[PDB]
Amino acid sequence: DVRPKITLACEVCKHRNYITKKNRRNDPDRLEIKKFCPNCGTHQPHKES
Amino acid sequence: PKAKTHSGASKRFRRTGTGKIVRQKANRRHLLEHKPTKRTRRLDGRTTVSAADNSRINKLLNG
Amino acid sequence: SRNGRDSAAQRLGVKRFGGQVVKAGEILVRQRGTHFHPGVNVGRGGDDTLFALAPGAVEFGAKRGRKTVNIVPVARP
RNA sequence: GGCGUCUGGGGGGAACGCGGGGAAGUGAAACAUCUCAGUACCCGUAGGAAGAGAAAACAAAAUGUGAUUCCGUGAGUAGUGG
RNA sequence: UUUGAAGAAUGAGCCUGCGAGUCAGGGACAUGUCGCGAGGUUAACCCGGGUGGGGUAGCCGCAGCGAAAGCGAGUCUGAAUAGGGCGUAUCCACACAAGAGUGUGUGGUGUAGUGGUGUGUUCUGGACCCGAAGCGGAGUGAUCUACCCAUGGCCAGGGUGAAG
RNA sequence: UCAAACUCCGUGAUAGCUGGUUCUCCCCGAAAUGCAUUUAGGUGCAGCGUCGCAUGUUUCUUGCCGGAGGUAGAGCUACUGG
RNA sequence: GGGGAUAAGCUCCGUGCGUCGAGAGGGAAACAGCCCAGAUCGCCGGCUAAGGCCCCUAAGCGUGUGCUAAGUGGAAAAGGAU
RNA sequence: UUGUGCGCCGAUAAUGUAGCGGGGCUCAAGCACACCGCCGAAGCCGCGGCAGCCAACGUGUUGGCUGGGUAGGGGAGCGUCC
RNA sequence: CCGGUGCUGGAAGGUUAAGAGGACCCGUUAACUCCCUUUGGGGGUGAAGCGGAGAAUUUAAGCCCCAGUAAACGGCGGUGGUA
RNA sequence: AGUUUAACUGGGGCGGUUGCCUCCUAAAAUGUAACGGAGGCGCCCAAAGGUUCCCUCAACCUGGACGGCAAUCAGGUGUUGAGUGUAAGUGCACAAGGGAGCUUGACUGCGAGACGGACAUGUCGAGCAGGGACGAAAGUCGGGACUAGUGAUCCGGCACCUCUGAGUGGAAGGGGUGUCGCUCAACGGAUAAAAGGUACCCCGGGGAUAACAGGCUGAUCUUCCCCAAGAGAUCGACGGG
């Protein structure tokens, strides 16, 4: 639709998932953002699932 | 006839060591995207039952 | 008629007045804009709420034309 | 099928038994799942009682109980439930 | 019953009788009272011609925290002695910390429940009493009336004048 | 007796509705508001009564002191509108 | 203060406002909501409040200084009026 | 002419005076301003009885306050039967 | 007037139940293979069997579809100009 | 055959409304009703978020090829009249308004103390630890100038966990943490699932509540009157009691 709910699984496995929204036509490609992952305890990149 | 206790109240309320009645806070099942983590943190855990509802919950639990 | 819609009252305003002693973290005013500006030992919140950063007594003053709220460190016994 | 001859049955009864069929008012502050309730009622059958009964059972590693029935607990608990 | 009715809101002709918060349950909560007291108490049942004696199975107190595994005066969350939540009867004294509200320890002090029964509420029962239109189950009715079936009866007198 | 007869039974059906509820005295003494409600004549919680316990004047009145307002009034080449 | 035609014995809000509700007694002719005043009981005692003092009707056809001619007193406007 | 205190028309519906409570009142019993008395309540005081709360001293006396009341809360009793 | 809804007739296609079908996957473990330590547990692969979920494919009426029918239920118009 | 078919309504019916945000009513704390008066919302932004640094508009005057009231350029005046994603309000020129560089804090574990509140919700928050962004540093950063952009519980889905696993080992199922699925918009959400007629009507209540009559008021009605513009004694407009 636009700004739907999207999930960022921790690239470093861990199944750490952040959620947020984005405009799926402003950014049709998958979102990539570097975020803190609790179990690893480090700032690893996160990829849209 | 022995009294029958309320099933839902038994599933929703607890008693602590000194007899305090303790419940869980609502608004924490779904729709947790737009909710900030501070809101979900203040909604986490258990609180004691308010004084207004104490008599009703005690009645629903004991019998 | 079109009318009939209104929002709830937000209970804004000043919570502690001049001379009242407060603890750190206590809310001083609830305002929309910066009608009062933070002074000494007074912080500003996300909704532009003023609160105390240290214990003491509320003092209302003006700084360069703006009404400000400050906390005075009352003397220890 | 007919004829003859012997032995049974038929119906009544207050409660209790067993096996079948099976409501609605009501409650859920409405109502259909659910409740009422396997109740009311009905059908078939007994006996002095009936039914059940002698493990294709429980149990949980105890070198454990040992047919059935009924009573008290377990327990308004484990659970189950628009 | 009402904001409000002396009544033009309600009910009552009169008298005498009768007529509405009761009972059950080791039910639940609170509060009296009695017994025992870190314990209290039995149920079914057994034996007594009784209201008495026995009966430990259970139940409630005696440790909590946690979803749970589990640990335990602690425990849960958490990477964390890093804060919070719940718990360690309560008070007192002494210290060491802080004046972000008081805390952390060392000694003492020592913690009260449970079983009868009274009372007030309460649960399940018709549950203070009275009062429908209606809903289900099983039966009874067509001697009234509606229609039909079988078999009988009745229709004074006077006109008109079809077919053939 | 008929927009679903009558009788008995379920049954003491159910009515947020209407009516009724019986001796005495002593002390205290309301409310007709807020929120929610398939809610508006009902109900839940709060507000206001009473009883018990705990706590003590913390309640209240008057004087003084420290505070924030945007009403009445007034004003407008201080703004916006007529 | 809003709504209504600032009309209603209309309606809806605010008020450490009052009274009635749940309040007797005195006054306003009568008169829940106005004024005075909060009834523990008795008295063939006294002083007062509101309101009154010619007679009904308790107490002054009270005193002093002025006004009114309209029974004004003892209901009402714009306006009119030697 | 100016302001003034009282007055006049405006004023005007259908049972019966009916817009002083009545009689009546200007020889005010009308109005204004001063003054003096008295009447007037279950208010206050006087004398006597009772009760609740509290205080003091005592082993129940005294004293101070209080005692309208619906819904309702608490306390103490009368009468009936077994 | 057969557009709507019924009714009657017809299936060339679309859709579609049960039943047949059981690919693929998953659980279990005979067997092995790696460890990692010492007074046997911790990882992987995994036949058959037994189970659990089950896909492609096949499949009728109905519906969609194609016609007819009003003495079937029903329906039967506006605007501007002009001698 | 069993049922459903909401509420508000100055009596009903048509209509409109039901949740959230902003102003007035609202009587200078807060709060305050009406089918009272005005508007908006059910989003948007990967930058319009974080940080560091820099800048200051609109309007007017003057001068400039098209070019004009009004495009872009220059000088001057200009303290807020511009603009702030979006209603309105309170703010913001110290900028929260305009520009650029790097970046993901649109974090994880928490949280003294508070505001608001019937309850359920809701709101602010210093500070501590981990691991980061920007910055020389001090420091700031737990989305956005602020206040709307939302939906409890139940039930189910997905990911992870050193939870559990009905004799045992597994597994199924259950549990925790994170999160997803409701114009449940009648927005505290009676069911997963629901429209009408009754003049054939019945029952129980209600003057809460109306119909006819009254009691009150007067938009309207009528009986008059006030000034006199006029026509010409009689009619009297325009206004007024």
**Helix (H, G, I), strand (E, B), or coil: what is residue C68?**
strand
- A2 Cβ under 8 Å from any chain B Cβ: no
Specify the number of domains making up chain B.
1
Domain that holds residue B38: 1-63
- B33 Cβ under 8 Å from any chain A Cβ: yes
Query: Residue A40 has what DSSP assignment?
Result: T
Distance spanning both ends of chain B, measured CA to CA: 12
**Helix (H, G, I), strand (E, B), or coil: what is residue C58?**
strand
Triad C5, C9, C12: Cα angle to 5°: 145
Residue of A nearest to B32 (CA): A19
Structure resolution, Å: 2.7
| Tokens read off for A16 | 């750490």
Query: How far does the CA of residue A37 sit from the closest CA of chain B (Å)?
Result: 15
- CA distance linking residue C45 with residue C69, whole number of Å: 14
C21-22 and A42-48: which strand pairing?
unpaired
Evaluate if the CB of C75 falls below 7 Å from strand E: no
For the residues of C7-44, what is the DSSP string, one character each?
PPP---EESS-TT-EE-TT-EEEE-SS-SSEE-TTEEE
